Design an enzyme around this catalytic site. Structure first.
Site, PDB file in Angstrom:
ATOM      1  N   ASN A   1      -4.826   7.613  -6.627  1.00  0.00           N
ATOM      2  CA  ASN A   1      -5.644   8.610  -6.079  1.00  0.00           C
ATOM      3  C   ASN A   1      -4.866   9.914  -6.551  1.00  0.00           C
ATOM      4  O   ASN A   1      -4.439  10.863  -5.917  1.00  0.00           O
ATOM      5  CB  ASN A   1      -5.979   8.823  -4.640  1.00  0.00           C
ATOM      6  CG  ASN A   1      -4.700   8.597  -3.650  1.00  0.00           C
ATOM      7  OD1 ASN A   1      -3.719   8.305  -4.101  1.00  0.00           O
ATOM      8  ND2 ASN A   1      -4.716   9.534  -2.569  1.00  0.00           N
TER       9      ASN A   1
ATOM     10  N   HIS B   1       0.722  -1.009   0.233  1.00  0.00           N
ATOM     11  CA  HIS B   1       0.145   0.060  -0.261  1.00  0.00           C
ATOM     12  C   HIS B   1       1.015   1.375  -0.026  1.00  0.00           C
ATOM     13  O   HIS B   1       1.419   1.679   1.064  1.00  0.00           O
ATOM     14  CB  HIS B   1      -0.960  -0.234   1.452  1.00  0.00           C
ATOM     15  CG  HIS B   1      -2.101   1.056   1.335  1.00  0.00           C
ATOM     16  ND1 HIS B   1      -3.396   0.825   1.494  1.00  0.00           N
ATOM     17  CD2 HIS B   1      -1.940   2.386   0.801  1.00  0.00           C
ATOM     18  CE1 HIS B   1      -3.998   1.964   1.562  1.00  0.00           C
ATOM     19  NE2 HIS B   1      -3.153   3.038   1.297  1.00  0.00           N
TER      20      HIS B   1
ATOM     21  N   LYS C   1      -9.249  -0.149  -6.280  1.00  0.00           N
ATOM     22  CA  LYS C   1      -9.053   0.647  -5.167  1.00  0.00           C
ATOM     23  C   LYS C   1     -10.518   1.165  -4.952  1.00  0.00           C
ATOM     24  O   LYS C   1     -10.855   2.225  -5.890  1.00  0.00           O
ATOM     25  CB  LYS C   1      -7.936   1.560  -4.898  1.00  0.00           C
ATOM     26  CG  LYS C   1      -8.087   2.251  -3.496  1.00  0.00           C
ATOM     27  CD  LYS C   1      -7.943   1.344  -2.492  1.00  0.00           C
ATOM     28  CE  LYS C   1      -7.588   2.333  -1.212  1.00  0.00           C
ATOM     29  NZ  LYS C   1      -6.639   3.218  -1.205  1.00  0.00           N
TER      30      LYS C   1
ATOM     31  N   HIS D   1       1.742   5.519  -1.803  1.00  0.00           N
ATOM     32  CA  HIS D   1       1.140   6.342  -2.682  1.00  0.00           C
ATOM     33  C   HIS D   1       2.476   7.220  -3.294  1.00  0.00           C
ATOM     34  O   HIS D   1       3.446   7.504  -2.330  1.00  0.00           O
ATOM     35  CB  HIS D   1       0.796   7.594  -2.002  1.00  0.00           C
ATOM     36  CG  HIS D   1      -0.713   7.307  -1.221  1.00  0.00           C
ATOM     37  ND1 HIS D   1      -2.128   7.292  -2.023  1.00  0.00           N
ATOM     38  CD2 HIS D   1      -0.979   6.374  -0.348  1.00  0.00           C
ATOM     39  CE1 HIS D   1      -2.968   6.667  -1.249  1.00  0.00           C
ATOM     40  NE2 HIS D   1      -2.331   5.980  -0.440  1.00  0.00           N
ATOM     41  N   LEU D   2       2.688   7.221  -4.664  1.00  0.00           N
ATOM     42  CA  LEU D   2       3.829   7.810  -5.173  1.00  0.00           C
ATOM     43  C   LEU D   2       3.608   9.064  -5.730  1.00  0.00           C
ATOM     44  O   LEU D   2       4.767   9.597  -6.129  1.00  0.00           O
ATOM     45  CB  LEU D   2       4.377   6.654  -6.218  1.00  0.00           C
ATOM     46  CG  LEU D   2       5.007   5.521  -5.583  1.00  0.00           C
ATOM     47  CD1 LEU D   2       5.461   4.570  -6.761  1.00  0.00           C
ATOM     48  CD2 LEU D   2       6.093   5.764  -5.111  1.00  0.00           C
TER      49      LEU D   2
ATOM     50  N   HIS E   1       3.293  14.711   1.631  1.00  0.00           N
ATOM     51  CA  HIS E   1       3.027  15.937   1.316  1.00  0.00           C
ATOM     52  C   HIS E   1       4.071  16.920   1.679  1.00  0.00           C
ATOM     53  O   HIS E   1       4.763  16.675   2.564  1.00  0.00           O
ATOM     54  CB  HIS E   1       1.698  16.495   2.304  1.00  0.00           C
ATOM     55  CG  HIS E   1       0.908  15.503   1.877  1.00  0.00           C
ATOM     56  ND1 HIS E   1      -0.361  15.461   1.105  1.00  0.00           N
ATOM     57  CD2 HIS E   1       0.338  14.237   2.978  1.00  0.00           C
ATOM     58  CE1 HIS E   1      -1.194  14.561   1.408  1.00  0.00           C
ATOM     59  NE2 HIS E   1      -0.806  13.695   2.307  1.00  0.00           N
TER      60      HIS E   1
ATOM     61  N   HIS F   1     -10.634   1.538   1.238  1.00  0.00           N
ATOM     62  CA  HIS F   1     -10.316   2.399   2.337  1.00  0.00           C
ATOM     63  C   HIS F   1     -11.661   2.400   3.062  1.00  0.00           C
ATOM     64  O   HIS F   1     -12.722   2.887   2.592  1.00  0.00           O
ATOM     65  CB  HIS F   1      -9.938   3.755   1.698  1.00  0.00           C
ATOM     66  CG  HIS F   1      -9.662   4.809   2.654  1.00  0.00           C
ATOM     67  ND1 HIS F   1      -8.448   5.599   3.077  1.00  0.00           N
ATOM     68  CD2 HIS F   1     -10.870   5.499   3.573  1.00  0.00           C
ATOM     69  CE1 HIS F   1      -8.786   6.419   3.997  1.00  0.00           C
ATOM     70  NE2 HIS F   1     -10.115   6.410   3.994  1.00  0.00           N
TER      71      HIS F   1
ATOM     72  N   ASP G   1       1.341   2.659   3.495  1.00  0.00           N
ATOM     73  CA  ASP G   1       0.577   3.913   3.232  1.00  0.00           C
ATOM     74  C   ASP G   1       1.366   5.020   3.285  1.00  0.00           C
ATOM     75  O   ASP G   1       0.808   6.180   3.751  1.00  0.00           O
ATOM     76  CB  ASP G   1      -0.572   3.937   4.198  1.00  0.00           C
ATOM     77  CG  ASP G   1      -1.768   4.790   3.648  1.00  0.00           C
ATOM     78  OD1 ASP G   1      -1.878   5.213   2.739  1.00  0.00           O
ATOM     79  OD2 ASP G   1      -2.695   5.532   4.432  1.00  0.00           O
TER      80      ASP G   1
ATOM     81  N   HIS H   1      -4.908  -0.570   5.457  1.00  0.00           N
ATOM     82  CA  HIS H   1      -4.502   0.245   6.713  1.00  0.00           C
ATOM     83  C   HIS H   1      -5.793   0.252   7.842  1.00  0.00           C
ATOM     84  O   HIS H   1      -6.307   1.282   8.341  1.00  0.00           O
ATOM     85  CB  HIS H   1      -4.162   1.856   6.398  1.00  0.00           C
ATOM     86  CG  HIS H   1      -5.461   2.494   5.693  1.00  0.00           C
ATOM     87  ND1 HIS H   1      -6.474   2.300   6.090  1.00  0.00           N
ATOM     88  CD2 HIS H   1      -5.145   3.141   4.332  1.00  0.00           C
ATOM     89  CE1 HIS H   1      -7.270   3.324   5.080  1.00  0.00           C
ATOM     90  NE2 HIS H   1      -6.286   3.666   4.205  1.00  0.00           N
TER      91      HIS H   1
HETATM   92 ZN    ZN Z   1      -6.725   5.022   2.425  1.00  0.00          ZN
HETATM   93 ZN    ZN Z   2      -3.400   5.016   1.128  1.00  0.00          ZN
END
Ligand code: ZN
Ligand code: ZN
Ligand code: ZN
Ligand code: ZN
Lengths: 331, 331
Positions: free
Chosen positions: A39, A11, A97, A13-14, A239, A124, A235, A162
Site C-alpha cells: 500500500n 504482515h 493483498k 509495512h516498510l 507514521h 484486510h 502490522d 490482523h
Molecule cells: Zn490491514
Molecule cells: Zn497492514
C-alpha cells in the site's frame, strides 16, 4: 531464557523513501523474512514496481542482516491476471493483498488465477461503508464478503490479516486448512479501554480498531491453544509524530522494534510458552509452503527501555510503547 | 433569523488562573448564567472557596457582559451537610455535583439534606471500574447507582448531566418531574465513528465518550420531541493543545465559542426549531426554579470561521471545530 528458530513477520509495512531507510533495520535485525505490504503511494501493482521496491528494501538492509522481503501485489480492478501469475512464478510476488478499496466482484479473473496457481490471498477484512459502526466492520466482512468468496473459490488459500474479533477467531478456528490468520501484538495485549480510558492514546489507534475485552480474550485463547493456522504478523505501520499526535492521527502502530518481546510476554501470561516458537517461526512457513529458518535467536528476561522517539529527516517516529519498559531483550 | 431569550449554560468548566481569564469571556458574552462545575485542583468543597472562585470568575468577566456564575459544590465524604445547606441558603451554591470518585453510600447525610432543602443534585453518571468497558459505564450507572438513589430519596431533584445513551434518554424521558438532563452539542452532532473513522480525533474525545449512532439518534429525538426536562449544557471543558494532541490526550471539548450555533444547526436538521428556544433559555430555569432571562439575542444564518487556536500564557487552546466553518453567527 527463550531459544527460538529465527522468526518471520507475516504482515509488515516498510513504506518507502527515507522512512523505509529508517524502519527496515528494525525488522531485518530480527526476522529472516517478512511479507511486505503493497500500500504505497502509488501502490505496488506491477512486477516491475515490486522488483524495484524489493531492491529499494534490500539497498536499505544493513550489512550482516540475513533478511528477505517477500513481496505482495496490491489487487486493483485493472490488474492483468497474467501479470500477477508471472510475478508469482518468477518469485517476485509471494502473495496478493485485498484492501476494501477493491471489490471482490470486480477481480474474479484475478482471484480465479490465484486459486489455480496456489497463490495466497491476504485480506484486510473490513466493510468500510460510512453507515457501519467502526466496531462492526470486521464482523460484517465475514458474512458479506469472506464466506461467499471462500464458497466460490474453494481451493483458494486466504490469510485473514490482523484479526481483532471473536467473530474472526471463531471463523478461523472453525475453517479449513486453506484458511489462516495473523494477529498483532497490540490486539493481544490491549482492548479498547486501553485506548480510551483515562485519555485517548493515538499510539494504540490502528486498524482494525481495538475491540472490547471479550474479543481480546478470544484472540489470546486462540494463540494460547496451539492452533497452528495463526502466526506472527506485526502490522508494523509507521507514521511520523506530527501524524499520530495531531487533530486527526493516523492508524497504525510502529511496533517492529518491540513486537517479538511483546508476543513472548503474552504467551508467558497465558501459560503457553510451548506454542510461542511455532507461532513466530513455524506456522507461517507451513501455511505458505516455505522452509522454516535454520538460525536461532534468544529472548532473555531483561528489562529493556523503549526509545521515546526515533529520528527521521524531519520530525520524529514514536515507537509502539515509547518511553516504556519491556520485559525481554533479543540476544 | 433566530431570535431567542438570552440563553444559559447548565453545565460549564471555567478552570482557574490564566485559563479562567482566557475562557470566561466566550461564555459571558453569550449566556446570562452558567452552572460552574467544581472540579478544580483542589476542588471547590467549601463556601469560602466557592465565594472566592466566583469572585475570580467575576474579576475575569469583561465590562458590559451581564453574566452570573451559578456555583456548585464538589461532593466529598468529608463535607458537612451544614456547610452545604448554608451555601445553598446564602445563594452561594446553586447545586451540588457528584463525580464517580465519590460514593453515594458515603454521603447519605449530605444527600438527605439536599432533598430536604430542595437543592438539585448534578450527576456525572458513570461507573468507572477498570473491568467495565468504557461504552457501558453510563448504562451501568443507571441500574447500579441512579435508580437505587432515586428510590431512596424520592423528593431529590437530579440532573443527569451530559447524557450520551438511549439508555439514559429513555430513563430521563420516562422519569418524573424531579429528573432532568443536559445534552452537549457534540453528543447530538456526532457518534463514535466521527471520532475514530479515517483517523483518531482527540478534539472529539470527551467524557462520557461518544457512543454508537443509535445513541446519538435517541438523543436527537429527545431534544427534537419538545420534552422539557432536557436543556443546554455544553460541558465546555478546555485543555491546552499539548494536552489534547499528545500521547495521552485529555477528555473534553472546548466548545463554549461554538456550542449555541451547533445546537441551532441540530434543531434545524431535526425540523424542530420551535423547540430550540425552550431548550436554550426556558427548560433549565424551569427545573432549577429560577427566572428566564429577559434580554434577547439573535442567531443569523451567516458563515463563520472558527479560530484554528486561541492563545494562552504558553502553548495554545484548540477550540471545538477549530479551523472549520459553522453556519450561524451570534448577533
Ligand atoms: Zn490491514
Ligand atoms: Zn497492514
Ligand atoms: Zn461530567
Ligand atoms: Zn463536566
Amino acid at each position: 531464557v527463550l531459544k527460538i528458530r529465527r522468526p518471520d513477520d507475516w504482515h509488515l509495512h516498510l513504506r518507502d523513501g527515507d522512512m523505509l531507510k529508517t524502519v527496515v533495520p528494525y525488522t531485518s535485525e530480527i526476522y529472516g523474512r517478512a511479507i511486505v505490504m503493497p500500500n504505497l503511494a502509488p501502490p505496488v501493482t506491477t512486477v516491475e514496481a515490486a522488483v524495484a521496491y524489493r531492491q529499494r528494501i534490500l539497498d536499505a538492509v544493513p550489512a550482516g542482516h540475513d533478511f528477505t522481503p517477500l513481496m505482495t501485489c496490491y489487487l486493483t480492478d485493472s490488474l492483468d491476471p497474467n501479470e500477477l501469475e508471472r510475478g508469482f512464478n518468477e518469485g517476485v510476488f509471494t502473495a496478493a493483498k485485498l484492501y476494501p478499496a477493491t471489490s471482490v466482484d470486480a477481480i474474479m479473473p484475478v482471484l480465479e488465477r490465484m486459486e489455480k496457481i496456489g497463490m495466497p490471498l491476504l485480506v484486510h477484512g473490513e466493510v468500510t461503508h460510512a453507515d457501519i459502526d467502526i466496531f462492526d466492520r470486521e464482523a460484517r466482512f465475514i458474512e458479506s464478503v469472506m464466506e461467499p468468496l471462500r464458497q466460490r473459490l474453494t481451493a483458494l488459500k486466504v490469510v485473514f490479516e490482523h484479526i481483532t474479533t471473536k467473530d474472526a477467531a471463531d471463523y478461523v478456528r472453525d475453517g479449513n486448512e486453506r484458511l489462516a490468520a495473523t494477529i498483532t501484538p497490540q490486539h493481544l495485549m490491549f482492548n479498547r479501554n486501553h485506548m480510551l480510558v483515562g485519555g485517548v492514546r493515538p499510539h494504540l489507534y490502528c486498524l482494525p480498531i481495538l475491540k472490547r475485552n471479550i474479543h481480546q480474550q478470544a484472540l489470546r485463547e486462540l494463540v494460547a491453544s496451539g492452533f497452528n493456522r495463526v502466526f506472527l504478523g506485526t502490522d508494523s505501520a509507521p507514521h511520523a509524530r506530527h501524524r499520530k499526535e495531531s487533530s486527526c492521527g493516523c492508524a497504525g502502530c510502529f511496533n517492529a522494534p518491540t513486537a517479538l518481546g511483546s508476543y513472548a510476554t503474552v504467551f508467558e501470561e497465558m501459560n503457553a510458552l510451548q506454542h510461542f516458537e511455532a507461532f513466530c517461526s513455524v506456522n507461517g512457513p507451513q501455511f505458505y509452503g516455505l522452509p522454516v529458518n535454520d538460525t536461532f535467536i534468544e529472548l532473555v528476561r531483561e528489562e529493556q527501555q523503549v526509545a521515546e522517539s526515533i529520528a527521521l529527516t524531519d520530525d520524529t517516529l514514536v515507537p509502539f510503547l515509547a518511553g516504556e519498559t519491556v520485559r525481554w531483550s533479543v540476544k
